[PDB]
Amino acid sequence: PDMDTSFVGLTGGQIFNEMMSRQNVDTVFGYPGGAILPVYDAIHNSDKFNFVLPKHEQGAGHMAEGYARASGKPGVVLVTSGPGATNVVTPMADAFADGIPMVVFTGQVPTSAIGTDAFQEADVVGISRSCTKWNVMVKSVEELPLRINEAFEIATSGRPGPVLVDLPKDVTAAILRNPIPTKTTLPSNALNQLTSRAQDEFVMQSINKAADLINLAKKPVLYVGAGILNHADGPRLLKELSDRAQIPVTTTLQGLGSFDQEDPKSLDMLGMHGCATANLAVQNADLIIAVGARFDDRVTGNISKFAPEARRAAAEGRGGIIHFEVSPKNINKVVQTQIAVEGDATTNLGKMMSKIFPVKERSEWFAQINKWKKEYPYAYMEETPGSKIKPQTVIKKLSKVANDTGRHVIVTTGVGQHQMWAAQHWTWRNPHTFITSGGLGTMGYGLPAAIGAQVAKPESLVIDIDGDASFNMTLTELSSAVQAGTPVKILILNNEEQGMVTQWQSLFYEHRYSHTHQLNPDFIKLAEAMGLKGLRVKKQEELDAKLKEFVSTKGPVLLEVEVDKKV
Amino acid sequence: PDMDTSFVGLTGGQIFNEMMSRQNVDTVFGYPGGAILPVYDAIHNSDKFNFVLPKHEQGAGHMAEGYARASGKPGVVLVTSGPGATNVVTPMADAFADGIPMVVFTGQVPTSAIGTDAFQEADVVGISRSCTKWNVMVKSVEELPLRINEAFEIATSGRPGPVLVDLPKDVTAAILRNPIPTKTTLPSNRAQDEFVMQSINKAADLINLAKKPVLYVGAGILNHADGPRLLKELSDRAQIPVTTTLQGLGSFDQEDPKSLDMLGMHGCATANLAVQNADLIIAVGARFDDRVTGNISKFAPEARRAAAEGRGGIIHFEVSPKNINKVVQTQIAVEGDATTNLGKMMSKIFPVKERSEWFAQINKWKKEYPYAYMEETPGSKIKPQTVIKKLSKVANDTGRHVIVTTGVGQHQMWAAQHWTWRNPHTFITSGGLGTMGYGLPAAIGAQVAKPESLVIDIDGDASFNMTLTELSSAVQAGTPVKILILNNEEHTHQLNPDFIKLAEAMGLKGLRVKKQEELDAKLKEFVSTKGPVLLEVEVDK
């Protein structure tokens, strides 16, 4: 039928509630206030949704991020006007940089008060314009389902990202009196979507040219990033291709977990803080197959000397770069490409799979590299009798202790040295288990991301590997964890005695001279004040028992490890 | 063309320091990161600046607001690119709404990297456009003095407010190689003057004519050092009763016999009745907010009648021409800085010995209509209004200068009403944006501004939870703030931490009151405690 009457007689708040169900939302992160009251009241006390409350709206925002990254669903945020809205700008910017689907609803002053400098009237659509894929102010209750459907579709398509929908108080309190078009109330499908001959042929041409090229070269590497994780079936098809054509796999920071690092063909992470084996494979390589990765500055060296062996194979028409990329703009934006395969990376891998010649082996490649490893494993000064505890050692031990439980394990982090140590020294096996702020690098991300991930995956063991300065940013959310019941495991690598700011350093043995020390709280007393268990390690001898207790503990728990200040 | 060589050979960082000095800045709030390092290092390393480190950049922003409100000086904020900048959007919007001078410097990716989706490239100029008076991205070290002086001038003139200056790391790291025009280095420096002097004369005439005038005073009187003194001088000279907005509290001594205290929806009846019966309203640095006026068509009926009869009405001393005749039609608008214009007006004011009938009516009202609320009965829970009244007296008996900040919620209004306001720049509260979590970092910044003052944060439990991580910042900064938590948490139920164990974990004394009989002693212990201290009082809902 043309018109939809099902919402007639409902308030905007009740329509919002119905629309969340139609979008298969079962979790909302948010915080009350006068402007959002009509919606908050319709949602907060409803059997249909788990409404998770932070102590600060920024915490709702990062919780929604961790929920989205752990679940593959959009994270939904509900906050009030004015400071409620301006408080979620950092999580929006964070979600925008990392391509995370987030739908932010902000209460607003009534439509009739817009542009009068009313109490808590902020220009939220203007403020959030550069850090959302799209935003809108809803102007009448008739328009509310439309904008909700548009918000969820835009957030979850192309490269996923945050969107904002501004909700004037008079609009959500109003009752819908008349029918509205059915087109505007039904969610988009994007599933069983028809395409034309023209469209089909276009992609298949680029698919054939790349299928023949991989089949050509036999010094290739798969260079994989976050985009392979944006389809349920990405990692499976990635391993399928890796196996079939015996192709070594290296990932970005944001692609960690998309490939089993135990697999003999794993190169692990590449770039500035990546391992030498991966990087050398890339300066070499006649063919880089880039899959859902954007060639960030920290991954590529200088562009010029970056993968010249691939550039030479390109000039000799025998290799180069293939880019499986969903957003045409990011194609040839940083490095110039030979073949572009536009669209969803996983879908295009699938289409391409049959056209791939099964490969025996490459051992001047495979038996090679496998020796690059020996001469360049990750190296750090390891403990000696009496020495301080090394953070890398903590992370390796913790990885093993978590693995021993046989549980699904999800790791979030703060931002800093501990973030890279986590990336490097944990052994990554499963998709959607490393949840870290990579594109914006938001300190304070770790704890609320862990809480939202835990809500997404109640059976998972969720560990926040955090820094002391990062953790201070958002530590009020400890009580949120206790209130939500989420049994997150919060690890603080406390290296407070070295400064936050490097003033200079030795040329070689990176002895760092630093300043700017923050005064930390007592983290164990803090944890107990907030209602959770606190554990502390001061010496090597107690590390193993405390890590075991940390992981074994029922309920949320904080473990502080005092660590050595020099890497 | 006059050229200056004195910065040549300096990095943008040292130039930044020198410009801070010329702007009389000695305090900076902020948080380091890579993009702002060339400037952060210069400021951190110089003993000419007290750099105050929060645990979150939002805390730096609200500290800077507290500092500005307490000192009359702009609050200077220094943060890094990306999330450093986005974390200060709430305090910018807060300062924008409340008209608080603030200069925000954000580190940015190098000029060459703008437009490349670089690590922490945020469009900060775009994000902050609607919550700053002005903002700019500095493009070369040559223009760094110019943009810094421009920023301070704009932040501190007209209606004060926040400005943002985006600093690419290649610009602040660069060494200045060329002479730059001397103008660009020196902080700031007739039909309209005649129209203003005419208005001053007409305003004097109307005031001299009035039989029942009322001064209606808001935040704008606090934006010049001499505002409160001239307000009092005018009130004494012409025997005019004075009511303040919420944001004008402290600008007039509420113990003065001529004080009407606060007007508005939550103001006292006597202030509202005086305004309703006045033949002349003299509005000084106040916005005519609808929480103050109520239904505008019913506001000041006796002043409207006097205007209709050519013998009174409304005078408005207002610095922004856009705010004139925006809400109420006025008989006379005196455009420009209120303090300045009061000073020019003063000699034209007729000294009035008495307004006996008018103050008799006012004093009758004061007796008939005090603030009222259900007070404690035996065994009952403590009332928050009672805590505030008792604490106002205890704080005043210390003999100290006392500054009050608050959170946002019912306690904020109770503080405004039930505290006795005596001195200017002592009520520091988020009114225009109503940002929960304001109270603690604002108190820390106010304490930095006035290290000898007793600084009390009257806070609520939900508001306090927003920014409680800054408790450790108070300890590190050596600011012995007195944090009062009025805990009315028995719809939406939030789990609070144990606030006393929290305070101890953060490094400061924690006190709790649960019963009426404990309250007096604990309030005394609270204000007498030497360092930072948190007192939680469990109150009725």
Ligand SMILES: Cc1cc2nc3c(=O)[nH]c(=O)nc-3n(C[C@H](O)[C@H](O)[C@H](O)COP(=O)(O)OP(=O)(O)OC[C@H]3O[C@@H](n4cnc5c(N)ncnc54)[C@H](O)[C@@H]3O)c2cc1C
């Ligand atoms: C202190 C610090 C140090 C860092 N150093 C490193 C480092 O050493 N090594 C490193 O790798 N990173 C490092 N980074 C992280 C870096 O900033 C980037 O965040 C990261 O490299 C991006 O990885 P990505 O390209 O996989 O993800 P993204 O930035 O999310 O880009 C993914 C690409 O895939 C595309 N895409 C998305 N979905 C799909 C789809 N369905 N199909 C096809 N394409 C899709 C996107 O459009 C995008 O172009 C560091 C971060 C910090 C905070």
Ligand SMILES: Cc1cc2nc3c(=O)[nH]c(=O)nc-3n(C[C@H](O)[C@H](O)[C@H](O)COP(=O)(O)OP(=O)(O)OC[C@H]3O[C@@H](n4cnc5c(N)ncnc54)[C@H](O)[C@@H]3O)c2cc1C
């Ligand atoms: C539920 C609720 C109830 C409230 N109840 C009350 C109440 O009962 N009473 C009350 O007062 N408030 C109340 N408020 C707060 C009220 O809404 C306003 O925030 C407050 O009254 C504004 O104070 P103001 O006009 O002094 O300050 P501002 O809004 O800052 O306005 C100051 C005016 O002075 C001008 N100005 C600035 N500097 C100068 C200068 N140098 N020279 C000349 N002019 C200058 C400005 O341009 C501006 O027009 C309430 C708020 C809420 C949410």
Ligand SMILES: Cc1ncc(C[n+]2csc(CCOP(=O)(O)OP(=O)(O)O)c2C)c(N)n1
């Ligand atoms: C919100 C925010 N402010 C500032 C920065 C800049 N910054 C990046 S790492 C870092 C120090 C991190 O300290 P910590 O969390 O203790 O990690 P560590 O390096 O000690 O492991 C800072 C200040 C940032 N990324 N985010």
Ligand SMILES: Cc1ncc(C[n+]2csc(CCOP(=O)(O)OP(=O)(O)O)c2C)c(N)n1
């Ligand atoms: C950042 C932010 N989020 C939400 C609101 C909406 N809000 C205004 S008052 C209030 C409750 C205040 O609680 P409390 O701090 O405990 O003060 P109380 O009213 O109990 O005294 C809320 C949620 C706000 N003003 N600011």
Ligand SMILES: [K+]
């Ligand atoms: K690893």
Ligand SMILES: [K+]
């Ligand atoms: K009072």
Ligand SMILES: [Mg+2]
């Ligand atoms: Mg640290």
Ligand SMILES: [Mg+2]
């Ligand atoms: Mg409360």
